[PDB]
Coordinates of C-alpha atoms and ligand atoms in Angstrom, one line a residue:
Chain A
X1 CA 0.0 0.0 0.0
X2 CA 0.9 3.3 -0.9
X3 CA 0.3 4.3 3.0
X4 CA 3.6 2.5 4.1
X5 CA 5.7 4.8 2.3
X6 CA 8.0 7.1 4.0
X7 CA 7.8 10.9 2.5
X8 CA 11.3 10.7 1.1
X9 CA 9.6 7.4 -0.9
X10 CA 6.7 9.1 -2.3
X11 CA 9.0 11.9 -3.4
X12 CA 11.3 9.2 -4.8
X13 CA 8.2 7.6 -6.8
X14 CA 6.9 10.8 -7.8
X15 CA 10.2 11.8 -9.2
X16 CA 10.7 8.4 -11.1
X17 CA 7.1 9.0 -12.5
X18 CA 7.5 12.1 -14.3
X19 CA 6.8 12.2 -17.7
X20 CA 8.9 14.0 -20.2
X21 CA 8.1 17.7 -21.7
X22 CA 7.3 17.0 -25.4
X23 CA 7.6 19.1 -28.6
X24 CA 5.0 20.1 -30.8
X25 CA 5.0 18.6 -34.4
X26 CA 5.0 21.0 -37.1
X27 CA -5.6 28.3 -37.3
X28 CA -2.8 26.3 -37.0
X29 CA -2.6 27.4 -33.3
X30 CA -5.6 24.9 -32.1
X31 CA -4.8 21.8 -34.4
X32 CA -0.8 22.3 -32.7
X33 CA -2.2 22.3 -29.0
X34 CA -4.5 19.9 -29.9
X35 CA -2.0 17.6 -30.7
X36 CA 0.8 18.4 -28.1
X37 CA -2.2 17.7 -25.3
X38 CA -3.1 14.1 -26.9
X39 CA 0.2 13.1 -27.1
X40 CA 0.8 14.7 -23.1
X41 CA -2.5 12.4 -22.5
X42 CA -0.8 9.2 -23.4
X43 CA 2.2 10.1 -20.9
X44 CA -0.2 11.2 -18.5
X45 CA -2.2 8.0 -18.1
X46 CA 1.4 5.8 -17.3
X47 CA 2.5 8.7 -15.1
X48 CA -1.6 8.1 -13.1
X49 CA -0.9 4.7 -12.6
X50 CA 2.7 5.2 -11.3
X51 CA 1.4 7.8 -8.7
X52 CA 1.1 5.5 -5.6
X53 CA -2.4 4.3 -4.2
X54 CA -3.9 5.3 -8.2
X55 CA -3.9 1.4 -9.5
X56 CA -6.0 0.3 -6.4
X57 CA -8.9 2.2 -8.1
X58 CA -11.6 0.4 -9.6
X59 CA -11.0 0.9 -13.2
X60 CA -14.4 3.4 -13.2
X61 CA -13.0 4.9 -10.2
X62 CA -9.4 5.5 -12.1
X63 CA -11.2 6.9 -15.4
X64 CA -13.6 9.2 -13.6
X65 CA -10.3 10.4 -11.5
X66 CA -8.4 11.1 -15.1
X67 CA -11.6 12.5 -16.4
X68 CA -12.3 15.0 -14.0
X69 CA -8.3 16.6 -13.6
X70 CA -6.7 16.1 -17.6
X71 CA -7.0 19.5 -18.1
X72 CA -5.6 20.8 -14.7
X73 CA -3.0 18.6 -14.9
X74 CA -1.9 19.6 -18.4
X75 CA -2.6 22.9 -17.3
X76 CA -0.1 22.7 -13.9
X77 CA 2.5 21.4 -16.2
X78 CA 2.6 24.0 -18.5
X79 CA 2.4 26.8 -15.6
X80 CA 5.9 25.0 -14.0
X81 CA 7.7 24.9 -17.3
X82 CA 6.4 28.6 -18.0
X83 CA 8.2 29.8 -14.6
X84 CA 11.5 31.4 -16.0
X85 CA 9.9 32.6 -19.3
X86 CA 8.1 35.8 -17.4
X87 CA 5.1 37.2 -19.9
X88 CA 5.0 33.8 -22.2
X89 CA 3.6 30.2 -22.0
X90 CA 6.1 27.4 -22.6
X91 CA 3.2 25.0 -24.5
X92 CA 6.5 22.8 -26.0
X93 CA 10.3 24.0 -26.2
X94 CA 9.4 24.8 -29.7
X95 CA 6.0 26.3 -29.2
X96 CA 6.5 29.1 -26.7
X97 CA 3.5 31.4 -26.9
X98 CA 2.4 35.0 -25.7
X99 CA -1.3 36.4 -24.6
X100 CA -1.0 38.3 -28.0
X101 CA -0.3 34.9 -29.6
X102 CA -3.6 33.4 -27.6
X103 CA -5.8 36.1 -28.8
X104 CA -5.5 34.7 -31.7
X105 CA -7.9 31.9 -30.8
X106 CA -11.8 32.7 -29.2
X107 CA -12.1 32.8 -25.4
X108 CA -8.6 31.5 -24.4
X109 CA -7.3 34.9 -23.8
X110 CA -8.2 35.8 -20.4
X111 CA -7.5 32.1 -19.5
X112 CA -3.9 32.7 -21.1
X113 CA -3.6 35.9 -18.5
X114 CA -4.8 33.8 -15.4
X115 CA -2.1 30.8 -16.6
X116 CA 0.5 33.5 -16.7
X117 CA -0.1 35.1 -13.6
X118 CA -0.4 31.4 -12.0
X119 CA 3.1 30.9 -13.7
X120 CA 4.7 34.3 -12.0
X121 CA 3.0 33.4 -8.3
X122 CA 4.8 29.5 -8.3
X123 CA 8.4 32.1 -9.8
X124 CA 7.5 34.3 -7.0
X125 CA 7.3 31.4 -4.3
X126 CA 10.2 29.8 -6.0
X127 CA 8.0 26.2 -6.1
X128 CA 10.9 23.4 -6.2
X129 CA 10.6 20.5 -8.4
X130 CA 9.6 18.2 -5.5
X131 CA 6.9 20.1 -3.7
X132 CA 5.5 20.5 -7.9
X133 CA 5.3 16.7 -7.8
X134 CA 3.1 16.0 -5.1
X135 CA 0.6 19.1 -5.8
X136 CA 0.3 17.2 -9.2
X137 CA -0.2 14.0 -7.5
X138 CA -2.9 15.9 -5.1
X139 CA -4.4 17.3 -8.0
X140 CA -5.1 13.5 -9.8
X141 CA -6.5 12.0 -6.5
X142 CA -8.7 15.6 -5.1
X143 CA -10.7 16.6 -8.4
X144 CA -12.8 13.7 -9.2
X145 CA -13.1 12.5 -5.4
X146 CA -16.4 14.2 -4.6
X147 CA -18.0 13.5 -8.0
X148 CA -17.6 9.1 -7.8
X149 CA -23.2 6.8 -2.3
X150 CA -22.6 2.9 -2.3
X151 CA -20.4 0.9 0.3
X152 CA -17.6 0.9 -2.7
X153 CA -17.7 4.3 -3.8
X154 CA -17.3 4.8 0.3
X155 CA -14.0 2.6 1.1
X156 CA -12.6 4.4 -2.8
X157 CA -12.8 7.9 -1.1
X158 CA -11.5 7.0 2.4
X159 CA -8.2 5.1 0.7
X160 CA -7.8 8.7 -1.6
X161 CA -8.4 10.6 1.7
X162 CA -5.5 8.6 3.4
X163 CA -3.3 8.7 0.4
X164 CA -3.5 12.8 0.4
X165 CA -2.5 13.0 3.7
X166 CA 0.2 11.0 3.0
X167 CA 1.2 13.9 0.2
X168 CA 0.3 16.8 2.6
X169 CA 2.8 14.5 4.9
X170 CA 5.1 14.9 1.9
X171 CA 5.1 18.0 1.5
X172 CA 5.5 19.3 4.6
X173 CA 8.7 17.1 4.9
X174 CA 10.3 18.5 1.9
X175 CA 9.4 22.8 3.6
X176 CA 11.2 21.2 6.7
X177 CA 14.2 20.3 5.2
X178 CA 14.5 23.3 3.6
X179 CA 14.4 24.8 6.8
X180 CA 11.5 26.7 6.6
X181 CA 10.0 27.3 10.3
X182 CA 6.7 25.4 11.1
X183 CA 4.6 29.0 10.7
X184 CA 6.5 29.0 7.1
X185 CA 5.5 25.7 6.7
X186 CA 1.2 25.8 7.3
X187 CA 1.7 29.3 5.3
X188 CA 3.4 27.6 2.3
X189 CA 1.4 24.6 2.3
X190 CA -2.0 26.8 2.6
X191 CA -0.9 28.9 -0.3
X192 CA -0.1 26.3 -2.5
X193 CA -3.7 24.2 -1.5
X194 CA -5.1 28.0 -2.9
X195 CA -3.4 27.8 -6.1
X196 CA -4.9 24.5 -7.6
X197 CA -8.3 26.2 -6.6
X198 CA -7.6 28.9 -9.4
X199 CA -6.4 25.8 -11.5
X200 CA -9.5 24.2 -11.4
X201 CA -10.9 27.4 -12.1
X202 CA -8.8 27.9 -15.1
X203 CA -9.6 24.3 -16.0
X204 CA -13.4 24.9 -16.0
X205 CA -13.0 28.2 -18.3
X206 CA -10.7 25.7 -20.3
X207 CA -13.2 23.3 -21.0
X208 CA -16.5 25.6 -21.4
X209 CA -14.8 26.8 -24.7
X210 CA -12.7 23.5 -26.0
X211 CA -16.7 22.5 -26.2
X212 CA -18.2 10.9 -24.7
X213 CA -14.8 11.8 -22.6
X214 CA -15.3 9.2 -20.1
X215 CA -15.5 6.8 -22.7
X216 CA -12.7 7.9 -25.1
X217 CA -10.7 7.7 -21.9
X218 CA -11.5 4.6 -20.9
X219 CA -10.3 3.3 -24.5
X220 CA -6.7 4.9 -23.6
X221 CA -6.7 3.7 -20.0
X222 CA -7.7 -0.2 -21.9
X223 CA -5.0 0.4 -24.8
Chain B
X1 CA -5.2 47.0 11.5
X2 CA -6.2 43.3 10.4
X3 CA -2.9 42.3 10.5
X4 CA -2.4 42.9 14.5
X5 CA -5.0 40.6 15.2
X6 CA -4.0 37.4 17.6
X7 CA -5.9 34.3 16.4
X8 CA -8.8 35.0 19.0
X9 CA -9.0 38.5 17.9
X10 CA -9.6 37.3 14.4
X11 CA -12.1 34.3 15.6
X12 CA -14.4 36.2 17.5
X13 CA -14.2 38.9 14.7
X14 CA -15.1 36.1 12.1
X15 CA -17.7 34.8 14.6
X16 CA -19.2 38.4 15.1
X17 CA -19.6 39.2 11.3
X18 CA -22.0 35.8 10.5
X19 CA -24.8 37.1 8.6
X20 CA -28.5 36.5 9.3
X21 CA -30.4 32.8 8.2
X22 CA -33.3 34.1 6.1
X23 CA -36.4 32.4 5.2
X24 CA -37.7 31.4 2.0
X25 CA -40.4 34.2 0.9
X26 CA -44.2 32.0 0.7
X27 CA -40.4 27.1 -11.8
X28 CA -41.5 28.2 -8.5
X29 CA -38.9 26.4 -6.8
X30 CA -36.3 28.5 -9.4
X31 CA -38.4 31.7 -8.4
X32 CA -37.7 30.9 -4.4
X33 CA -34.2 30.1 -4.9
X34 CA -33.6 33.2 -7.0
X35 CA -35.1 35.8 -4.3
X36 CA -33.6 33.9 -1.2
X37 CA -30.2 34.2 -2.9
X38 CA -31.1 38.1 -3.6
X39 CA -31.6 38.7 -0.4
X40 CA -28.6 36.9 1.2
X41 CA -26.6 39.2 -1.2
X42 CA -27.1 42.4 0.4
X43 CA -26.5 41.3 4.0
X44 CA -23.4 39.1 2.6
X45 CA -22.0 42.5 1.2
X46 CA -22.2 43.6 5.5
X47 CA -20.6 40.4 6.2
X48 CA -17.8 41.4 3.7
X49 CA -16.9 44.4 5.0
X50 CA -16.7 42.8 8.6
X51 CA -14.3 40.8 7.5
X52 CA -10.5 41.8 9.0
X53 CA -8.8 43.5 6.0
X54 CA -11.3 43.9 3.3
X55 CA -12.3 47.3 3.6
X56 CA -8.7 48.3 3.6
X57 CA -9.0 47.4 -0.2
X58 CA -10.0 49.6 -2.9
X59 CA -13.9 49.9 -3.7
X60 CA -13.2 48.2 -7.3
X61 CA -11.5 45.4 -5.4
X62 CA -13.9 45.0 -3.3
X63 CA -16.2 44.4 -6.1
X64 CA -14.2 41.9 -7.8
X65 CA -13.6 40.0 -4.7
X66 CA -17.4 39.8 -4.5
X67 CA -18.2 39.3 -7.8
X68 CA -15.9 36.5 -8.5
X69 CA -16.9 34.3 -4.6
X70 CA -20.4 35.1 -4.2
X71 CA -22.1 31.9 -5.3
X72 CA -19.1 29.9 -3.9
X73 CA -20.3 32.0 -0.4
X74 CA -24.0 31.0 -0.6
X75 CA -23.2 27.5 -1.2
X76 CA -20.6 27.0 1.7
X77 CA -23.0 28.5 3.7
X78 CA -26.0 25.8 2.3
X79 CA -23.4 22.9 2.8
X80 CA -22.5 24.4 6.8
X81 CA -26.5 24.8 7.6
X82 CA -27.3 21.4 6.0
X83 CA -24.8 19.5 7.7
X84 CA -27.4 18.0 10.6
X85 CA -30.0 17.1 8.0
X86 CA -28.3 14.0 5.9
X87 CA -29.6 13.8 2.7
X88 CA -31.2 17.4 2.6
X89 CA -29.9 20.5 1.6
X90 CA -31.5 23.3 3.9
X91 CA -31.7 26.5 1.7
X92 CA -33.6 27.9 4.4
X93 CA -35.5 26.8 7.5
X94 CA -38.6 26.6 5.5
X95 CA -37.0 25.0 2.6
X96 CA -35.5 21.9 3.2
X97 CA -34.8 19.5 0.2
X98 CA -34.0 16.5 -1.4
X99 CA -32.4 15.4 -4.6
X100 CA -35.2 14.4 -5.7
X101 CA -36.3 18.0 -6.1
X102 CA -33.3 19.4 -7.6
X103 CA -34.8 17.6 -11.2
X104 CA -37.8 19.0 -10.8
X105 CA -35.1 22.0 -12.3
X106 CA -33.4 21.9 -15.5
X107 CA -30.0 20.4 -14.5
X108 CA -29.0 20.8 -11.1
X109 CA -29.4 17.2 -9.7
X110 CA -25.3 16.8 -10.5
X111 CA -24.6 20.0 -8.5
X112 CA -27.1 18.9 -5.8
X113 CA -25.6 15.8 -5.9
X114 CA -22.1 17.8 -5.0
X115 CA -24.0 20.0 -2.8
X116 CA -24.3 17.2 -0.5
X117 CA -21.5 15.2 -0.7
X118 CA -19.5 18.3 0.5
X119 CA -22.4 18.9 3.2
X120 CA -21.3 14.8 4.2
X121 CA -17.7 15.5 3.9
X122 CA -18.1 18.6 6.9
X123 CA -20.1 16.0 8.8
X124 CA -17.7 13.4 8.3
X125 CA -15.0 15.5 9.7
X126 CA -16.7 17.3 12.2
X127 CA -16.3 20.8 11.1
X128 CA -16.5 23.5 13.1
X129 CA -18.1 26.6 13.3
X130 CA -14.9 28.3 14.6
X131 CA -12.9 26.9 10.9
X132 CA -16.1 27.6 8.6
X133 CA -15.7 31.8 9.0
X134 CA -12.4 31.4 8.3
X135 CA -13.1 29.0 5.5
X136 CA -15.9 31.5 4.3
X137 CA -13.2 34.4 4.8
X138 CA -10.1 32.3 2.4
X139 CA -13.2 32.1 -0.5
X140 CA -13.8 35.8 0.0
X141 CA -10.3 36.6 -0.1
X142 CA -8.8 34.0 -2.6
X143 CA -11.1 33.7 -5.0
X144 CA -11.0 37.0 -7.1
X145 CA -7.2 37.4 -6.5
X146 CA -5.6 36.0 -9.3
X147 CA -7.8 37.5 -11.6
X148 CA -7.0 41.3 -10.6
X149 CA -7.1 42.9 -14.2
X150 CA -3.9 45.0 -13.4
X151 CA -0.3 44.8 -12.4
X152 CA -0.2 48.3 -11.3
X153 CA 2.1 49.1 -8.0
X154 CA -1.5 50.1 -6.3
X155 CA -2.6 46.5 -7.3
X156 CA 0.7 44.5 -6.3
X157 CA -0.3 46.4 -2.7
X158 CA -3.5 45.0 -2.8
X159 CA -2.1 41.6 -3.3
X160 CA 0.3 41.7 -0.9
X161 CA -2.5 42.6 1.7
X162 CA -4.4 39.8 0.9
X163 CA -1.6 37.4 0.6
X164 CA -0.8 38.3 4.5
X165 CA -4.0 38.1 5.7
X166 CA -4.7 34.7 4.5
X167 CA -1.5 34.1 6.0
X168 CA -2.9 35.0 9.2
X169 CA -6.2 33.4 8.6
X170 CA -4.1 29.8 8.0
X171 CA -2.4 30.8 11.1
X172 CA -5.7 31.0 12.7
X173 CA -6.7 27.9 11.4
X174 CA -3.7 26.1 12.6
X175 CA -4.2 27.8 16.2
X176 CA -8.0 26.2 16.1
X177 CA -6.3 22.6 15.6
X178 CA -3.6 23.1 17.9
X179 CA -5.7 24.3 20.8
X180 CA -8.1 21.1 19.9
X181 CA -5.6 18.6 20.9
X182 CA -4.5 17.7 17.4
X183 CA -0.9 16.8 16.6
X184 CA 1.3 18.7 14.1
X185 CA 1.4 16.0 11.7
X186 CA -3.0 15.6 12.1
X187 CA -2.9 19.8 12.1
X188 CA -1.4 19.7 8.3
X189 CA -3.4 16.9 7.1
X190 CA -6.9 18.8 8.6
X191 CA -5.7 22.1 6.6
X192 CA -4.8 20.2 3.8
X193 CA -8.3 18.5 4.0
X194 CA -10.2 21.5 4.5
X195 CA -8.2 24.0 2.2
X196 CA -8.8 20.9 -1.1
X197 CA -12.4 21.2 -0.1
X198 CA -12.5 25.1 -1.8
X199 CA -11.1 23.4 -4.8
X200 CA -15.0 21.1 -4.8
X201 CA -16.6 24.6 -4.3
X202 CA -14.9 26.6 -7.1
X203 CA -16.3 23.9 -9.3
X204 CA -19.7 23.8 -8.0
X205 CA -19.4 27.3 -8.6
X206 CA -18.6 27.3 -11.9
X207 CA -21.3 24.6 -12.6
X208 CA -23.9 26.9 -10.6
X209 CA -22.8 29.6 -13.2
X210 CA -23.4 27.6 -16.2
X211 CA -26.6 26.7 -15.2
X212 CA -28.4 30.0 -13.6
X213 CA -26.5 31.8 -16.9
X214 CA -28.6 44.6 -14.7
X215 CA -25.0 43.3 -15.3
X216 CA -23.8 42.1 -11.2
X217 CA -20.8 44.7 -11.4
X218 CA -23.1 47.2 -10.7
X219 CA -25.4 46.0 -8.7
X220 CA -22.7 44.9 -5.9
X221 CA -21.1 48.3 -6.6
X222 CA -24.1 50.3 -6.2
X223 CA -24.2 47.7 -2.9
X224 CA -20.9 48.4 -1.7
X225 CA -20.6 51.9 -2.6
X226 CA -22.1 53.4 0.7
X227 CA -22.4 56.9 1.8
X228 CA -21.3 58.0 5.3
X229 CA -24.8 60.2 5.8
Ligands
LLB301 C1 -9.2 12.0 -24.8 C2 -9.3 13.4 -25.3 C3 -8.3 14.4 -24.7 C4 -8.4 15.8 -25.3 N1 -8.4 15.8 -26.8 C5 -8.6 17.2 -27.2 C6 -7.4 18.1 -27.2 O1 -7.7 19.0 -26.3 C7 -7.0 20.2 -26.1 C8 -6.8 21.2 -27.1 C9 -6.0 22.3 -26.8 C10 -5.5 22.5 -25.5 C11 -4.8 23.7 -25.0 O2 -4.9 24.7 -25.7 C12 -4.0 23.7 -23.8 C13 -4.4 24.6 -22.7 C14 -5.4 25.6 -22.7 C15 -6.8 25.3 -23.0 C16 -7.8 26.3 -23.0 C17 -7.4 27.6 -22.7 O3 -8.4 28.6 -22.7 C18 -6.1 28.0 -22.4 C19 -5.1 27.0 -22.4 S1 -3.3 24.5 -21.4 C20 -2.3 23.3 -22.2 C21 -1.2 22.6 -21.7 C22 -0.6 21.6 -22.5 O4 0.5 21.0 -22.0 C23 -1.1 21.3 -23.8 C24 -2.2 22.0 -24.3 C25 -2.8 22.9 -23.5 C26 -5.8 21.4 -24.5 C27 -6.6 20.3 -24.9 C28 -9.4 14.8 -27.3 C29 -9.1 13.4 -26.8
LLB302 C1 -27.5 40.6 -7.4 C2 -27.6 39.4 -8.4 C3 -27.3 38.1 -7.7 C4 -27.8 36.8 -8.5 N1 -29.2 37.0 -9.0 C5 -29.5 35.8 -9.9 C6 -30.1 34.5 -9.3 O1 -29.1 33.9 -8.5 C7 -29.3 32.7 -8.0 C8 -30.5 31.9 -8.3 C9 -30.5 30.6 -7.7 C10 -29.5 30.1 -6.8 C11 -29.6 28.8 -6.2 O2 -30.5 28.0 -6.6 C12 -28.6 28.3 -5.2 C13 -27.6 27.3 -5.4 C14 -27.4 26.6 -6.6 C15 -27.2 27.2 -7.8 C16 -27.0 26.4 -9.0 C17 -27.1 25.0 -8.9 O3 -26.9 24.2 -10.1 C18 -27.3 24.4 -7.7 C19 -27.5 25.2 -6.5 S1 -26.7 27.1 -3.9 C20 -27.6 28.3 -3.0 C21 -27.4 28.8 -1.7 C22 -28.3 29.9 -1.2 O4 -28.1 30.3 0.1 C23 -29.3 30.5 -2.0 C24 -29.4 30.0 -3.3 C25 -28.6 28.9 -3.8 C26 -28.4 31.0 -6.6 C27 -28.3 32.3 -7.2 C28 -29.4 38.3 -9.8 C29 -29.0 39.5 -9.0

């Protein structure tokens, strides 16, 4: 069970299970990002089932999980890689974007401003690589949870609940030994919790305007 | 002025500010829930402005602040007062209902459905009434602030204001678990827990939006924008 592990093994498996930034392959604009976020998909799913306590999902459980946080997932991904390019998206190392380049699609705009700014407060708190990890991690198991009334669907949200306080456990392990004081510790940890609610914000806008799911997912989850 | 406040201070100030429960005035049903929400605007603007550091802000913030939580506010506020009715969601006390009456409206059986799994989460963790203000006083806060249209030096003020009183407001929070018996390890989980459940509430927000859509920047303006007479 992933509830064993010690913090410095869940960083260690999160770390192992990172999936690789791709490049995009080349109006344009949509087909290119629609593209780069399929092929992100298919690394996404292997990354979900390395993230420990994922796999002892049902299978429904797993898909509605992957269903529900895709988009903030591919959206916190692009946010981290954006950090050090101040003003511009990193999409792909070969696709690096600005808000007048996002205009240039319908909608996306003030969604490309909110990613931004969400890129400049992680720069700002300097977010290391590790603490990135788990709030990806807390992301995949939080933002289907409350969205699965059976005896099932009951045991599949406690194990999710113990599994994220294993990650806050995390965490909070990794603020101590930087050396961050226990009041700079809740304060960090707060602030960061308060960030993926604007990311599931910005995921929601994402999706009203990039408009079944479940199913296609399921298919990719299968394959 | 906000930022001097111990933990107690900021409790009891939280605690003092708690707006009125109002009745339901008697789709009908659509009709009730539209002019109970109307009405818990206004005294939620009071609220507002009793919470510690908000009326430092600019009137424009204030506005976007509002603008951007309000329907996460009413429905934190649904999930606390239908905690001790499983299976209900108490609008107000003369309008208690059931899922079953959420389809009886063109669809908001999922977000009912949401409504009270997050009322069954409180319940299942015993919130209390002490950590809902300052859960209602985060939304407030948090909600609108990464969507400030401006990076002007006024604005990155403003920021900075709010980013330290959430910071105290966490503080707070941990002070509530501390004094509660919990160890430090349980006091990061219960934040942790707590602070993902805002996450839900954005969502059912944005849900709540999609479905219900004088534009509300003005109206909240008008609201806010008091004279001193
Ligand atoms: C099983 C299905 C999976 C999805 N397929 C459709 C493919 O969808 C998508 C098409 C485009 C985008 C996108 O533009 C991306 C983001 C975005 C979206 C909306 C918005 O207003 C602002 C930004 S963030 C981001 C990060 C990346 O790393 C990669 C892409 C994006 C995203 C998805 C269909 C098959
Ligand atoms: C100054 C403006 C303010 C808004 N006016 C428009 C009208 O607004 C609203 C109309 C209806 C509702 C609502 O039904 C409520 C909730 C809800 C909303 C959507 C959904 O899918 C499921 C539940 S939760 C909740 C809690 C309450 O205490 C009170 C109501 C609700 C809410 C707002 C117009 C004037």
């Amino acid at each position: 069970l992933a509830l064993s592990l010690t913090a410095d093994q869940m960083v260690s498996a999160l770390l192992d299970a990172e999936p690789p930034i791709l490049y995009s392959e080349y109006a344009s604009m949509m087909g290119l990002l629609t593209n780069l976020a399929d092929r992100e998909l298919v690394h996404m799913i292997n990354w979900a089932k390395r993230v420990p306590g994922f796999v002892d999902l049902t299978l429904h459980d797993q898909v509605h999980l992957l269903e529900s946080a895709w988009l903030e997932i591919l959206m916190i991904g692009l946010v981290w890689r954006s950090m050090e390019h101040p003003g511009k998206l990193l999409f792909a190392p070969n696709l690096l974007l600005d808000r007048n380049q996002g205009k240039s699609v319908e909608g996306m705009v003030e969604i490309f401003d909110m990613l931004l700014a969400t890129s400049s407060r992680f720069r700002m708190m300097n977010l290391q690589g590790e603490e990135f990890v788990c709030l990806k991690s807390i992301i995949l198991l939080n933002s289907g949870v409350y969205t699965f009334s059976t005896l099932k669907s009951l045991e599949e949200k406690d194990h999710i609940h113990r599994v994220l306080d294993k990650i806050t456990d995390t965490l909070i392990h990794l603020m101590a030994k930087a050396g961050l004081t226990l009041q700079q510790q809740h304060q960090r940890l707060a602030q960061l919790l308060l960030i993926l609610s604007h990311i599931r914000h910005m995921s929601n806008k994402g999706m009203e305007h990039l408009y079944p799911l479940y199913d296609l997912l399921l298919e990719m989850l299968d394959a």
